[PDB]
Design a protein that fits this description.
monomer; Ubiquitin Ligase Nedd4, Chain: W; three-stranded antiparallel beta sheet; Peptidyl-prolyl cis-trans isomerase NIMA-interacting 1; mainly beta; 0% helix; 3 strands
Length: 35
């Protein structure tokens, strides 16, 4: 785990894929969130 303040690193079982979720902008991406 190595994300900035505000982001939450989550994991999606079954398929085994990494996905991030921002509780500030409720945005979802598939890459290292920079800011």
């Amino acid at each position: 785990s190595k994300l900035p303040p505000g982001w939450e690193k989550r994991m999606s079982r079954n398929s085994g894929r990494v996905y991030y979720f921002n509780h500030i902008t409720n945005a979802s991406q598939f890459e290292r969130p920079s800011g």
